[PDB]
Design a protein around this ligand. Structure first.
Ligand SMILES: [Cl-]
Ligand SMILES: [Cl-]
Ligand SMILES: [Cl-]
Ligand SMILES: [Cl-]
Ligand SMILES: [Zn+2]
Ligand SMILES: [Zn+2]
Lengths: 21, 30, 30, 21, 30, 21, 30, 30, 21, 30, 21, 21
């Protein structure tokens, strides 16, 4: 997922925001 | 806002900045 | 180990180090 | 919660393990 | 997104995450 | 400036984008 | 507690969290 | 003072420490 | 040692604790 | 260079950057 | 010590070099 | 430049100081 995506390729803050409660 | 390459505690820091008082879950694969 | 004030970013970093692979949740409003 | 337990007062690394999945 | 107190190092880190490639300036005295 | 806007008072990620080149 | 992969200032941060008011020495090879 | 290998937000942190109240510009290539 | 071990392979917090005073 | 309040983690990070290869000691209770 | 010299009061990068090995 | 130099090879704090205002 995201942890892997942000770290192995790249991610946007908007994608991260999907992890907020 | 730009794309970011984000490993280890940098990921969790960015989640902290982006989510704030809403909080978040940190769910790494295995 | 020991007892420190962990605020903001510092708290999530500490959770990252403590929990690692397991993952964690950060829920200020609770 | 965690913020109360750790920032205003203090907590141990062991208490922080309460918030691990 | 959200509103937090960002002081010292924390402010420049947040600028790094927000601005990235673009770069930024950090000018306390202004 | 930025220090006044963010440390003493509070700011959004969007305000911080004011200081991007 | 889990294993951690820890480079640069992340190592020193973890020592700070683990050692606290007891302190520590940071002794890199050469 | 020693040489340092410095990537991502670590670079910006070091600039913050070295420059202080003088501030700085962060100017990455493209 | 530890710096090299934690960084090149991995280490536990319990191993780190060997570096406390 | 410059003069800042460096507390907690921030102090050890600064020592890491300043001392690097040499290593350092962090002894709060002294 | 260092905590007194740097957190409560202020210190320079040069003073911090006092704590290098 | 510096960002690339500090990250891909190494740089001194004295070199960084060239980026201060
Ligand atoms: Cl890193
Ligand atoms: Cl803080
Ligand atoms: Cl702080
Ligand atoms: Cl702090
Ligand atoms: Zn890092
Ligand atoms: Zn802090």
């Amino acid at each position: 997922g995201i942890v892997e995506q942000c770290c192995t390729s790249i991610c946007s803050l908007y994608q991260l925001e999907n992890y907020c409660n | 806002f730009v794309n970011q390459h984000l490993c280890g505690s940098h990921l969790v820091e960015a989640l902290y900045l982006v989510c704030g008082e809403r909080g978040f879950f940190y769910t790494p694969k295995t």
